[PDB]
A paper describes a structure:
KLHL12 belongs to the BTB-BACK-Kelch family of proteins, which includes E3s such as KEAP1 (KLHL19) and gigaxonin (KLHL16). Interaction with Cullin3 is mediated by the BTB domain and a ‘3-box' motif from the BACK domain, whereas the Kelch domain mediates substrate capture. In the current work, we address this gap in understanding, by defining a consensus recognition motif ‘PGXPP' common to both substrates and co-adaptors of KLHL12.
Author numbering:
A (entry chain A): 279 to 352, 357 to 567
B (entry chain E): 656 to 663
Write the structure that this text describes.
Amino acid sequence: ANEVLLVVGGFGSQQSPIDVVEKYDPKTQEWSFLPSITRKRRYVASVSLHDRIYVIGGYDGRSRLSSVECLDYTGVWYSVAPMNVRRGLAGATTLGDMIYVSGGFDGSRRHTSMERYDPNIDQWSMLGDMQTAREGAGLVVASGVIYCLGGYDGLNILNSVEKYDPHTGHWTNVTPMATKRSGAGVALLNDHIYVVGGFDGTAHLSSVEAYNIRTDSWTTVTSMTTPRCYVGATVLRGRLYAIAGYDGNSLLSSIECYDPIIDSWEVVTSMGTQRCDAGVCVLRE
Amino acid sequence: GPPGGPPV
Ligand code: NA
């Protein structure tokens, strides 16, 4: 019944992409290492699904990537089928028993497209396009529907939000966020979508907003302890964790935790690898 | 360089 945090890859203090994989357990507050990924990837995404960690896309310093590798967490990494497109700073989520990845950047273009991974046939299928091309936007599932949030189209940091209805296969617009953010963290918690930090085009942000789904409205939440952009976000037993990132001067090694009980953020660790644009996901143990 | 990133 006990979940843990996972952090893969990203951009490290030696200002290169890394291959470090870390586990963080919030109950003991201990860190540990898992086996490294095969290649070093910054700008990278990660999801877990049925006790399998997938590492998706990213950028190694020479090329952006379509490759994807896998680890049965119950440890050696192995390659599975590649995406149709090379994607860094892509959004990524799971729904049903599928992976969905959307947006990103191949080295020339930002993508509107979303593709989907089926572990039963080891194949990535392309789906319908978003209206806006987005890098640095997160994907989050709520009640069987996918939301893409904020990001960057090549010219503008975005406050726009789109939702994908699997019953229709179409994207539609939702009410936008109050502030434009790229590199923000996004997670679902108690039927609200939280967006934490990111970069609005001038300032690195500590600000947090929450989308009430039942009302189609956004509200300001308590700012984090420190600005963070290109930051991971995940929910673990009813609490929202902000993970590493860039504060606009330095790479963060700390995770902070938002407890709705106190409506407040607490640093729970100062000890991970400093890094940003890494992938994060939750593991059942 | 994505917006708001560190120097490289
Ligand atoms: Na509030």
